């Protein structure tokens, strides 16, 4: 009692019903996976930038 | 047109190949060292063949390389032993040559009964200035056709020096 093993029939149609729309993009992407040295530096630089901006517009 | 194209002895390799290793091999290395004035290098086996009774890495041979006036004088001894009779077939097509002798005592070595009788072959490699050019690390090169050695030129040189002729055939 053998049966059909595999097929890609109807798969593209099923995908394209409500499918291949592009993923949504963001400003300020996640900083995970980037160099942790750069992460520490960016954290300190952002803190300093916020402090300086508050000082500039008190 | 011959400023530096004159031939000069590059080196003389003194080679013996013993069918077996052990006492024969070390005593033959010893006599070669005593004849050459320097320690020789032992050559192992490249593969295994049953007829010659050899196996891989067996230290089959011993040879040495001598250059300069000592090479020249050892050559003079070799030609004296060989009666200064050489062959065109003996001479190679690249300009180098050589020949083999037996009973090394003929060269003028004091017979030690321990070492016994041991033959050996001399091979003379010959060229002109430019060996540094051909085998220096930086900017490797090859000498030109005119600067390259050849059989007729080397037989002419070998006759003119020592006035030792070669038989026609």
């Amino acid at each position: 009692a053998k049966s059909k093993n595999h097929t890609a029939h109807n798969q593209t149609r099923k995908a394209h019903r409500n499918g291949i729309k592009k993923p949504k993009t963001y400003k300020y992407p996640s900083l995970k996976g980037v160099d942790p040295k750069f992460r520490r530096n960016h954290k300190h630089a952002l803190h300093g930038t916020a402090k300086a901006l508050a000082a500039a517009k008190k | 047109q011959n400023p530096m194209r004159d031939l000069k002895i590059e080196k003389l390799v003194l080679n013996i190949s013993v069918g077996e290793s052990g006492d024969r091999l070390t005593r033959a290395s010893k006599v070669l060292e005593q004849l050459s004035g320097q320690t020789p290098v032992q050559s192992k086996a490249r593969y295994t063949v049953r007829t010659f009774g050899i196996r891989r890495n067996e230290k089959i041979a011993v040879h040495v390389t001598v250059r300069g006036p000592k090479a020249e004088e050892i050559l003079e001894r070799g030609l004296k032993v060989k009666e200064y009779q050489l062959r065109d077939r003996n001479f190679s097509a690249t300009g180098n040559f050589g020949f083999g002798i037996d009973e090394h005592i003929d060269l003028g070595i004091k017979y030690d009964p321990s070492i016994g009788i041991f033959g050996m072959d001399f091979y003379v490699v010959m060229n002109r200035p430019g060996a540094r050019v051909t085998r220096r690390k930086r900017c490797k090169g090859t000498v030109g056709n005119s600067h390259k050695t050849t059989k007729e030129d080397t037989v002419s040189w070998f006759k003119q020096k020592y006035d030792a002729d070669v038989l026609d055939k």
């Binding site: 099923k14 995908a15 019903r17 | -």
Partner: protein, 159 residues
């Protein structure tokens, strides 16, 4: 049994080249990639560390991370009915900049130049690109170019 390895069916794809074997020229190491740069992936068969997968061979992505000898590239890969963001740690030998992005940046600079020129005098710059318009009317001469009449040739074996 079936075989689906990491480098399966990559014979000719990762085949190095014809008469381009051996060491790689140092321009590739001299190129500089920053975060946000669009880069093309073409795996080098002679370099085995940092090699991308055969799927990402020939794809284009955005640099999101920079490291000692590598670069983080973001590729949108179609998985089923959607694209997922895959992050690759590729090497500078396998990675290469995008001439398309360079051309677009050059066009942006040019476009700004023409807009500045328009602000200078306003000569209807028409910033946007237009497709291949149909060719307008033209008059072609026959002096020295009298039409040579052609006819279909009879069949011949030609063997």
């Amino acid at each position: 049994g079936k075989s689906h390895g990491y480098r399966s069916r990559t014979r000719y794809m990762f085949q190095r080249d014809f008469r381009k074997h051996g060491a790689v020229h140092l321009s590739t190491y001299l190129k500089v990639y920053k975060v946000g740069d669009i880069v093309d992936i073409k795996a080098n068969g002679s370099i085995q560390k940092g090699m991308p997968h055969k799927f990402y061979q020939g794809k284009t992505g955005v640099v999101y991370n920079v490291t000692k000898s590598s670069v983080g590239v973001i590729i949108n890969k179609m998985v089923g009915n959607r694209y997922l963001e895959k992050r690759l740690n590729l090497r500078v030998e396998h990675i290469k900049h995008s001439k398309c992005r360079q051309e677009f940046l050059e066009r942006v600079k040019a476009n700004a130049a023409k807009r500045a020129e328009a602000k200078a005098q306003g000569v209807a710059v028409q910033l946007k690109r237009q497709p291949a318009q149909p060719r307008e009317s033209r008059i072609v001469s026959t002096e020295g170019n009298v039409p040579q009449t052609l006819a279909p040739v009879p069949y011949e074996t030609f063997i």
